[PDB]
Amino acid sequence: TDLSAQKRLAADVLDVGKNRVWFNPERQGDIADAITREDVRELVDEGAIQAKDKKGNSRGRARERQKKRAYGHQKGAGSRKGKAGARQNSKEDWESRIRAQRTKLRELRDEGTLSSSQYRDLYDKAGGGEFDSVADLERYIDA
Amino acid sequence: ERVVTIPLRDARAEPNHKRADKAMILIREHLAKHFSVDEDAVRLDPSINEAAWARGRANTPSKIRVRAARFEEEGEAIVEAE
Amino acid sequence: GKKSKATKKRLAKLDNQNSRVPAWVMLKTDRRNHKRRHWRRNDTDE
Amino acid sequence: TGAGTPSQGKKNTTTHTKCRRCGEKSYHTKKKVCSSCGFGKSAKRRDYEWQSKAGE
Amino acid sequence: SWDVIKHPHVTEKAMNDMDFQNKLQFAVDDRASKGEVADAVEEQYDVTVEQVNTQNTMDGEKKAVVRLSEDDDAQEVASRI
RNA sequence: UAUGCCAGCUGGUGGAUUGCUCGGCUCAGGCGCUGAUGAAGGACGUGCCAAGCUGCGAUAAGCCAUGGGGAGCC
RNA sequence: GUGGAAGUCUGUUAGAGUUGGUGUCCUACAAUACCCUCUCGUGAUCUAUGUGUAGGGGUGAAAGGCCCAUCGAGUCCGGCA
RNA sequence: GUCGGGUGAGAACCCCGACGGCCUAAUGGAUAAGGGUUCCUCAGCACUGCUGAUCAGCUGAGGGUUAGCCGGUCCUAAGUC
RNA sequence: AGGGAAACGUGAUUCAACCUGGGGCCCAUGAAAAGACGAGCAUAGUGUCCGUACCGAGAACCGACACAGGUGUCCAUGGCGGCGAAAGCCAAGGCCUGUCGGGAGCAACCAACGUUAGGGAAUUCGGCAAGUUAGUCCCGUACCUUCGGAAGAAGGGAUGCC
RNA sequence: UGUCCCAACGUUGGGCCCGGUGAACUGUACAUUCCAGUGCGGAGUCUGGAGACACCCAGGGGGAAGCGAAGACCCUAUGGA
Ligand SMILES: [Cl-]
Ligand SMILES: [Cl-]
Ligand SMILES: [Mg+2]
Ligand SMILES: [Mg+2]
Ligand SMILES: [Mg+2]
Ligand SMILES: [Mg+2]
Ligand SMILES: [Mg+2]
Ligand SMILES: [Mg+2]
Ligand SMILES: [Mg+2]
Ligand SMILES: [Mg+2]
Ligand SMILES: [Mg+2]
Ligand SMILES: [Mg+2]
Ligand SMILES: [Mg+2]
Ligand SMILES: [Mg+2]
Ligand SMILES: [Mg+2]
Ligand code: NA
Ligand code: NA
Ligand code: NA
Ligand code: NA
Ligand code: NA
Ligand code: NA
Ligand code: NA
Ligand code: NA
Ligand code: NA
Ligand code: NA
Ligand code: NA
Ligand SMILES: [Sr+2]
Ligand SMILES: [Sr+2]
Ligand SMILES: [Sr+2]
Ligand SMILES: [Sr+2]
Ligand SMILES: [Sr+2]
Ligand SMILES: [Sr+2]
Ligand SMILES: [Sr+2]
Ligand SMILES: [Sr+2]
Ligand SMILES: [Sr+2]
Ligand SMILES: [Sr+2]
Ligand SMILES: [Sr+2]
Ligand SMILES: [Sr+2]
Ligand SMILES: [Sr+2]
Ligand SMILES: [Sr+2]
Ligand SMILES: [Sr+2]
Ligand SMILES: [Sr+2]
Ligand SMILES: [Sr+2]
Ligand SMILES: [Sr+2]
Ligand SMILES: [Sr+2]
Ligand SMILES: [Sr+2]
Ligand SMILES: [Sr+2]
Ligand SMILES: [Sr+2]
Ligand SMILES: [Sr+2]
Ligand SMILES: [Sr+2]
Ligand SMILES: [Sr+2]
Ligand SMILES: [Sr+2]
Ligand SMILES: [Sr+2]
Ligand SMILES: [Sr+2]
Ligand SMILES: [Sr+2]
């Protein structure tokens, strides 16, 4: 008996890769008589032909690592492979910081805390990279 | 029918990436001899196959306990794990 | 490639010629297609 | 890269094809001229006395 | 003068088209258009042709798949030849 | 007496030799233009079964007339 | 600090190439191949297809290099015995 | 690769299952050129296949490519006639 | 509608495709034409002709071959990893045809490779071959210089896990 | 730092034996040779001695001025480019 053709039809009718279709060893004769796709669907229902399950990689070990690293662990010098600028894009970081400092200054202004002129002076200084962070900016504003 | 312990140390004579194969051969030869039957008449149950290939093709267990029965008109043996 | 209708007609003919000399011709002439071609071993024209 | 075998693998261009006028696979589909019968080049049929021995 | 219809194309696939889709298949002159195939057929077996699909075959001939109207029954038309 | 040398016998292999000739080669005489009224050439078709050759052209190994011929033919 | 230039650097990214082994092969897997090492990799870059230039003529960042395994003058047939 | 089994006159290499492996810009998917039926089915093993063969891109016989809206077809590019 | 044995979700982050802007460069300036828009709606009819299989490669192409060569495009966002389209391992998918097998602790010899005490280039034309170093962070860095560079100079320290 | 002193042990594929498949190079003849001599002065084959029972397996290549290519070097030709 040669069932490679039936294997091809079964993969199509079961909508799976040929390598995953299973043919019951005790029914080679019946499967061998299967000519049409209808013949294959029939044997599928009988359970003579089935589709093996596909694998999915476990992410459990990854998840634990993700947690440790999110908590700031497992990132010591001995675990870094890329250059510092590769681990954190500097221009990107500046965009993060400067936007946070401007949003900050914009809120203080509409809030009345700063006069357009005080705002301007702080805004221009931020753009000149005078403040390391939002807090650094606040500390400054507090004279 | 009886339980026998097959030593597979002689598989070490074959290249290491193919030890499993040689093991399966030693097993057949051991039974054929000890049960006084032709190697052609020795049937190895898949259980034995899986035992020898457990760690892949390059790692065989040093020995293996196998349960074999001898019978029929032409004289043959059937073997399996234990 | 892309075959035109004419190319196709020519390929079709070549396919037809590529057949066995009928058995009855064997008997009638009391005893070979010298133009037998293989798609791989040979090369057609055009 | 050698001019031999390695350079033969790049040959997948179609040039000479079956000619409408004479039937020979000599119609250069890029020049639109038959190298065998002259179709596309001359109304007269391509011919030369050197295609045979001089006294024949 | 060449005729349009050459002969009925009879094969397993042709029969299925005839039993399940009221379609008839013909080997026809490769110079014939879908329309010319439609007319010729209606005039040879007196039926109403609804659609015609064509294919230039690797046998050097043209094959036509002619679907008849629900008014006609392919199985019966083909059965009289 | 192994491996083996030389000669022959029986049987192979091989296709020489002899015989045979539907093919060539050369000479002699005769004859001699074809095509837009689409030639020559080619392509693709065409048979009950049909691949090749030959013939033929959708009227497709053929259709018609006259004379010849003759009980066979495809 | 920002910015992000460059015939700019690293890079078996794709892709291109080939310093050494004078390794393997050398009736080959191959009439120019295999492996490791090595070089280039935003530009005078690499690459597909189309197209043009023809033989004492092309094409050549020039080696007499290349113009279908052949070029200090291609190939084919003819001159030709 | 191995153990069982299937088919067969015949099975290391044709098929089923299990176990064991290989490939991740590819050894996976879709395609251009080019090839031209190599595609599918049945029946086969003299030929072809780095051994064998019940297999096959092999041999015999049949079958298969369906479009207003996917290409062509239309436009013009270097350029050609 | 369809599809699924079933459930037949909801929010979020990072965001290829695709959309839309801002900046910079040129002794370099990055096609053309057909067509479309501009220019409504109903209903009906017509929409012919050619291609369409398959391979697309360690056996369907070229290389005399079922040749380890050569041969364009797109899949560039599958998981862990890490800077990564890197390595290594693993899915989806494919394969056991980079197609002869059986046997000998399986000798000499050869290919490719692992490990070698002490000495450490004595070897050799020549460190050829092999090896040494190595990723990332911190400290630190000479001569010279066209002030750009030299420079990762050199040298020193650190590196896991919880 | 096995490049070396100075080599050793191990790994994988071959090698060896068995089944199947199955070429090519080369071949005036003879041929078991060795030491001297002789010879166109570089002999398995001539001369004189010596040695030599036949056949087979594996081996590394001393000889056959080994095989492969009508020497590329040099000269000659009332040769070529
Ligand atoms: Cl298309
Ligand atoms: Cl902007
Ligand atoms: Mg079959
Ligand atoms: Mg910056
Ligand atoms: Mg292995
Ligand atoms: Mg056929
Ligand atoms: Mg169509
Ligand atoms: Mg080009
Ligand atoms: Mg192969
Ligand atoms: Mg040492
Ligand atoms: Mg010395
Ligand atoms: Mg070195
Ligand atoms: Mg000479
Ligand atoms: Mg000279
Ligand atoms: Mg001269
Ligand atoms: Na071909
Ligand atoms: Na027909
Ligand atoms: Na005449
Ligand atoms: Na015929
Ligand atoms: Na600056
Ligand atoms: Na090199
Ligand atoms: Na010339
Ligand atoms: Na990733
Ligand atoms: Na095989
Ligand atoms: Na060593
Ligand atoms: Na020797
Ligand atoms: Sr070929
Ligand atoms: Sr080059
Ligand atoms: Sr190459
Ligand atoms: Sr090409
Ligand atoms: Sr012309
Ligand atoms: Sr002439
Ligand atoms: Sr056909
Ligand atoms: Sr660069
Ligand atoms: Sr680089
Ligand atoms: Sr060299
Ligand atoms: Sr090396
Ligand atoms: Sr070589
Ligand atoms: Sr870049
Ligand atoms: Sr050349
Ligand atoms: Sr001549
Ligand atoms: Sr047989
Ligand atoms: Sr097939
Ligand atoms: Sr965004
Ligand atoms: Sr398709
Ligand atoms: Sr592919
Ligand atoms: Sr390839
Ligand atoms: Sr898989
Ligand atoms: Sr095989
Ligand atoms: Sr050790
Ligand atoms: Sr030295
Ligand atoms: Sr020295
Ligand atoms: Sr350091
Ligand atoms: Sr003597
Ligand atoms: Sr030897």
Short mmCIF file of C-alpha atoms (C1' of nucleotides) in Angstrom, two decimals, chain J residues 36-79:
data_model
loop_
_atom_site.label_atom_id
_atom_site.label_comp_id
_atom_site.label_asym_id
_atom_site.label_seq_id
_atom_site.Cartn_x
_atom_site.Cartn_y
_atom_site.Cartn_z
"C1'" A J 36 80.43 -5.39 -12.55
"C1'" G J 37 81.60 -4.74 -17.48
"C1'" U J 38 80.36 -3.59 -22.54
"C1'" G J 39 77.62 -0.69 -25.80
"C1'" C J 40 75.65 5.91 -29.63
"C1'" G J 41 79.92 7.14 -23.46
"C1'" G J 42 73.02 6.86 -18.41
"C1'" A J 43 71.26 -1.81 -19.94
"C1'" G J 44 65.53 -6.09 -16.50
"C1'" U J 45 66.95 -8.13 -22.33
"C1'" C J 46 74.48 -7.90 -24.71
"C1'" U J 47 79.17 -10.45 -21.63
"C1'" G J 48 80.97 -12.60 -17.05
"C1'" G J 49 79.58 -14.00 -12.46
"C1'" A J 50 76.10 -13.99 -8.41
"C1'" G J 51 71.22 -15.00 -6.84
"C1'" A J 52 66.49 -17.13 -8.12
"C1'" C J 53 60.49 -22.98 -6.04
"C1'" A J 54 55.16 -20.95 -7.99
"C1'" C J 55 51.17 -17.94 -6.72
"C1'" C J 56 48.61 -14.26 -3.65
"C1'" C J 57 47.58 -9.86 0.29
"C1'" A J 58 48.96 -4.96 2.47
"C1'" G J 59 52.55 -0.96 1.99
"C1'" G J 60 55.58 3.32 1.25
"C1'" G J 61 57.17 4.84 -3.93
"C1'" G J 62 64.25 3.23 -5.34
"C1'" G J 63 64.29 1.95 -10.82
"C1'" A J 64 61.64 1.13 -15.67
"C1'" A J 65 66.64 7.89 -17.92
"C1'" G J 66 57.69 5.69 -15.26
"C1'" C J 67 52.79 8.06 -17.39
"C1'" G J 68 50.80 12.77 -19.17
"C1'" A J 69 52.36 17.31 -23.65
"C1'" A J 70 55.86 16.26 -31.71
"C1'" G J 71 60.96 21.41 -25.51
"C1'" A J 72 58.36 26.39 -23.60
"C1'" C J 73 65.08 27.28 -23.12
"C1'" C J 74 68.94 27.43 -27.50
"C1'" C J 75 69.82 27.37 -32.66
"C1'" U J 76 68.20 26.61 -37.82
"C1'" A J 77 64.01 28.02 -41.92
"C1'" U J 78 65.83 33.11 -48.25
"C1'" G J 79 58.79 30.31 -41.71
#
